[PDB]
């Protein structure tokens, strides 16, 4: 628990199991310091890293699909599947969800009846964003482990990598994908020390400060 100990990351991943003291299986972070000005337009970081292993209930799919797909959306474990009809229900004002995918067959009433609602919130199924294909298993898993991460005016950044639930090695591995994409992200004309201090933490329990090259 002293705030001085840096510990590593395999060290972390076992620790933060231990350190999760709630009546429900907490939600696994990774927190950043950067050393990055955000009041500056050059120097933002903001994107997505796709974890090895997904999050379960931490990204709500629903997939849009048609037949065959249909059951194959429910097998990959989409929380929400439908075909065209579900179209109404966001009409109705239902966002129950955080990711969207579909097959390409149902995109004409998606794209038509749902751009300028799902459109605008980022949540449109997107060839671009591979989140429209008949392989809509592999998306729909893919998309379960799809963060989105986005700095604060403070310069302070964080993500869930996992469930204090899970196996050591799989939180270790997540963590340190989570890494590698904020180093992918570093603005080009950031200066300083990127990585200033990084911690891992449980929704509830303390924080364990991790040197995040281990
Ligand atoms: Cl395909």
Do not use: C
């Amino acid at each position: 628990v002293d705030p001085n100990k840096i510990y590593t990351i395999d060290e972390a991943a076992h620790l933060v199991k231990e350190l999760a003291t709630a009546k429900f299986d907490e939600t696994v972070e990774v927190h950043a310091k950067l050393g990055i000005d955000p009041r500056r337009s050059d120097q933002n970081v903001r994107g997505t890293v796709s974890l090895p292993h997904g999050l379960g209930k931490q990204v709500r799919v629903l997939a849009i699909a048609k037949g065959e797909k249909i059951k194959e959306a429910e097998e990959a474990g989409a929380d929400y599947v439908g075909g065209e009809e579900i179209i109404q229900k966001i009409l109705d004002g239902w966002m129950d969800f955080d990711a969207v995918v579909a097959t390409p067959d149902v995109m004409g009433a998606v794209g038509s009846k749902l751009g300028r609602i799902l459109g605008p919130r980022g949540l449109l199924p997107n060839p671009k964003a591979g989140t429209v294909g008949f392989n809509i298993g592999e998306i729909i898993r893919e998309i379960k482990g799809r963060i989105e991460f986005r700095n604060d005016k403070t310069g302070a950044i964080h993500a869930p990598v996992g469930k204090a639930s899970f196996p050591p090695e799989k939180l270790a591995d997540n963590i340190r994908a989570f890494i590698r994409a904020l180093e992918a992200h570093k603005p080009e004309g950031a200066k300083g020390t990127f990585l200033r201090s990084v911690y891992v933490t449980t929704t509830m329990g303390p924080s364990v400060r991790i040197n995040p090259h281990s």
